[PDB]
Amino acid sequence: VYEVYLDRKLLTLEDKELGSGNFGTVKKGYYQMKKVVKTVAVKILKNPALKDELLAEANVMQQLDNPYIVRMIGICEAESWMLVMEMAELGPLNKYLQQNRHVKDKNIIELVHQVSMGMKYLEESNFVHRDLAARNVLLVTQHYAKISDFGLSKALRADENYYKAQTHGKWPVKWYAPECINYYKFSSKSDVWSFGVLMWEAFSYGQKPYRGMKGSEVTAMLEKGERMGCPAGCPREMYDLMNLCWTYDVENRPGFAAVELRLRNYYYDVVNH
Ligand SMILES: c1cc(CC2CCOCC2)n2nc(Nc3ccc4c(NC5CCOCC5)n[nH]c4c3)nc2c1
Numbered sequence: 001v002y003e004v005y006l007d008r009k010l011l012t013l014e015d016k017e018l019g020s021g022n023f024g025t026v027k028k029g030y031y032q033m034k035k036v037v038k039t040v041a042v043k044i045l046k047n048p049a050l051k052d053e054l055l056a057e058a059n060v061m062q063q064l065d066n067p068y069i070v071r072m073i074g075i076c077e078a079e080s081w082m083l084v085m086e087m088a089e090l091g092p093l094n095k096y097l098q099q100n101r102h103v104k105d106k107n108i109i110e111l112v113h114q115v116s117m118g119m120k121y122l123e124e125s126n127f128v129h130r131d132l133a134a135r136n137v138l139l140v141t142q143h144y145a146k147i148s149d150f151g152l153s154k155a156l157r158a159d160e161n162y163y164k165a166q167t168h169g170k171w172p173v174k175w176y177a178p179e180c181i182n183y184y185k186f187s188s189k190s191d192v193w194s195f196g197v198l199m200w201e202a203f204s205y206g207q208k209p210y211r212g213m214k215g216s217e218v219t220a221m222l223e224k225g226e227r228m229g230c231p232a233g234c235p236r237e238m239y240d241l242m243n244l245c246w247t248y249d250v251e252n253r254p255g256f257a258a259v260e261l262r263l264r265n266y267y268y269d270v271v272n273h
Contacts, residue, residue: 001135002170003215004062006031008078013042018091022170023050023151024080031073031084040073043083051081053151058083060150064125068118070138070148088138088146094206096139101205103142105233106270111137111145112202113263118147119195120256123188126156128163130186132194133175134201154186162187173215179250181219189250192259196245197228203238204231222248237266 016028024046030037045051054075061072073084090096093111097103115137122129129150136149154163162185171180177193179185197209209228210218227246230239241262247253254262 001133001172001174003173004058004074006074006076006084008076011040011042011076011084018087023053028087038073039087039089041085041087043085045081047080054081054083057151057153060127060153060155061085063155064122064127064150066118066121068114068146069121070146085148088140088148090139090141092135093137093139093145094134094201097134097202097206103205105203105235106267107143108202109235109238109263109267109270110143111139112199113260113267114145115147115198116195116256116260116263118145119191120260122147122191123256126161127153128156128186128188129153129191129194130163131172131175132191132198133172134198134206137198156187162190174210174218177250177253178219178222178248185250187250188255189253192245192253192256195256195259196242199238199242199245200228200231203234207231235266 010032011029013027013029018026018028018041020026024044026041026043028039029042030039043054045054058072058075061070070088071086073086076082076084097108115132119129119132129147130152131149132147136147138146138148140146152169156163162179165184165186168184173181175194175197177190179187180190200209201207210221213221227243230236241259244254245259
């Protein structure tokens with residue numbers, strides 16, 4: 001793929017892992033809030049660099065408030081450093097669709113439209129996601145999605161509308177727009193390209209994009225005018241949207257306002273019927 005404070009006491013962990021990886025691991029558990037318990041997902045560090053990513057990440061989530069954006073609870077220093085987030089019970093979109101091949105097309109339009117609303121709100125909030133991928137969209141129900149995974153995300157300086165990475169740390173290049181690859185500039189619009197790839201994954205029931213290919217070759221294919229083909233079952237109007245998200249010229253590519261609305265209407269055309 002890749003080429004605030006809390007009483008540790010008020011919090012139980014389970015030997016039930018919700019993904020993991022480089023940093024450490026994510027685990028299930030729950031937190032005693034005001035009256036009740038909240039079921040939670042907790043990102044734990046395997047322990048210097050990691051601990052500032054986590055704080056930047058928490059500080060980003062701290063700032064975001066939207067129904068299609070996963071909610072931070074807070075953080076906790078104990079045997080390890082931990083980020084505590086409200087649990088999306090059904091989990092990753094890609095792994096869901098992989099396991100439930102018979103989820104109806106209308107259902108898929110519903111879920112991607114929701115991501116689009118999440119992203120429309122980020123764009124308006126002047127944050128860039130920088131990891132927008134099926135693997136990081138989480139299902140609360142079959143019919144309710146939230147965006148997760150803000151480990152690479154960034155609040156945009158007030159003078160600029162892009163973030164300039166300096167050093168390519170390990171990057172999900174198959175989701176990255178050409179400007180990210182060439183000029184390391186990441187914007188709302190870059191995330192639109194990622195949304196395009198995310199849409200493609202969704203309608204392919206969670207198949208990996210550009211299968212069989214390296215970022216080397218993907219990057220050659222995109223430069224050669226070439227894009228991924230329409231997935232079995234996808235509606236024409238939706239493959240038109242994917243493609244529009246894959247506009248090479250950042251200037252000419254649609255923003256999240258536009259994408260959100262276009263999806264809104266198509267869903268409502270499908271719903272009404
Ligand atoms: C914030 C962060 C994360 C970790 C996320 C952050 C984004 O990257 C992935 C980790 N999660 N994970 C959840 N809920 C959840 C439920 C079940 C699974 C699950 N169950 C497997 C069972 C076997 O077949 C595959 C899925 N895997 N992950 C899951 C996550 N909710 C959240 C909220």
